[PDB]
Write a protein that binds this ligand. Structure first.
Ligand SMILES: [Cl-]
Ligand SMILES: [Cl-]
Lengths: 95, 95, 92, 95, 92, 95
């Protein structure tokens, strides 16, 4: 992941952890080979296991999953009906 | 799955539930494509290791031959030598 | 940071340690750009809320004026009204 | 693991977690195929990651590792020069 | 659990919750035989020390008299002298 | 290891250090017999993900052809497509 994408993920930290729905997201992430299944189990157990803690670990770990991790992640957002969040992200990448 | 397989699984169920740490099995099965994320989230919501294992078994009970093989291969691969031995004679044909 | 700022932090470090949920506060500081992912991980490694909070304070103690303001803003925005007041005077 | 061995690990909980040296133990456990490498990484991160927390998770998890888990575990104690702890366990099992 | 015992626990559940490192206490109760691995895991799952302690107390409230004495002895042997005294009176 | 392999690692070291989550690599390498427990403990002792990756690479640079392959395979197997691609041309002939 390039520095600009990483920086984007940090800038949107608050919004991501506040709004990301994860339970519905795992299938999408798998389909696009963003994470291996055990990686997902680890993220699921991050911290207290709340939605927020999972979300946070997801987006941190996301930075390590490749050059195209960010656009692929936006797509998974789209695929799971999180258009608003995906929209917030995209309009930054472009910005 | 074939009756031989289901029956073998039912016969050795308690042993299976006592020992299985699901986090080391569900990953393989998800990789293999014979367990759903939704099923995995259901398992994960059980508070103890044995309850997790129990749920997992119920789910596998209702599944197909390829699944039993997936499960068995996971058990064997994760060093559950004894448990794998119990299911061995129950393995069915696959293509 | 300025001396008054640092001192202000020292004066209230204990009250801060006891009360703050570090993960929320770090969320803000990450967003603001005044904390790194590696620093965040260092903090999270600590085995208790207090040791997590303590570590963050230690790191902040070595950061610039903007970092102090980020921290103050995090407190305020997360509803730590009383704790924010304690550091208000020290805002560089 | 049979009920008597499980009971033993419970009875000896306090002594195990007080005295077990884990850093030198991992190679032994692997040589005897008691745990997979990733299980070891997980046990290493249990709780605070203290010797005691690792040790506690180790012995809890030990219960799931098979019919010979206890005797094999004792052997690894002996392998790593923890003979006083191994003797403590040994004598209890026969009693 | 006896009546006076159960009540003495309820009486000091807050002070108990606050101070105890549940993992050490459960180590004792596991060894004594008054806590199961399954129950211990249930406790461990709770995301904070206080919640861990709370869960433990919740469970102990539903246990027998020996369970209380096991708990009492755990506290004593781990150096929680003051906490132990509070509970001393309730000893079935 | 061969100079080709080693120089390939050196060239891409920074990318590797930024992304590698060691807990998903060290396991494979230990299973394969090309990373030791004590090396893994030395890695684990680093406080951050990138520091752990850095340590692991330090260790690997000193190892043989098989080890490089072990590393590469684990990378590929754990979904680090881009990272494996960087290391592909540096793969040494083995066995
Ligand atoms: Cl960083
Ligand atoms: Cl149990």
């Amino acid at each position: 992941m390039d520095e600009a994408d990483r920086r984007l993920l940090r800038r949107c930290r608050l919004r991501l952890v506040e709004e990301l729905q994860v339970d519905q997201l795992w299938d999408a992430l798998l389909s696009r080979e963003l994470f291996r299944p055990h990686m997902i189990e680890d993220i699921q157990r991050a911290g207290s296991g709340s939605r927020r803690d999972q979300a946070r670990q997801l987006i941190i770990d996301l930075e390590t999953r490749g050059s195209q991790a960010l656009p692929l992640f936006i797509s998974c957002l789209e695929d799971t009906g999180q258009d608003m969040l995906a929209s917030f992200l995209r309009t930054n990448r472009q910005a | 799955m074939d009756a031989k397989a289901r029956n073998c699984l039912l016969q050795h169920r308690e042993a299976l539930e006592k020992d299985i740490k699901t986090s080391y099995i569900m990953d393989h099965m998800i990789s293999d494509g014979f367990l759903t994320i939704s099923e995995e989230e259901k398992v994960r919501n059980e508070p103890t290791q044995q309850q997790r294992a129990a749920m997992l078994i119920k789910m596998i009970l209702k599944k197909d031959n390829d699944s039993y093989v997936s499960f068995y291969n996971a058990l064997l691969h994760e060093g559950y030598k004894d448990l794998a031995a119990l299911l061995h004679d129950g393995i069915p044909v696959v293509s």
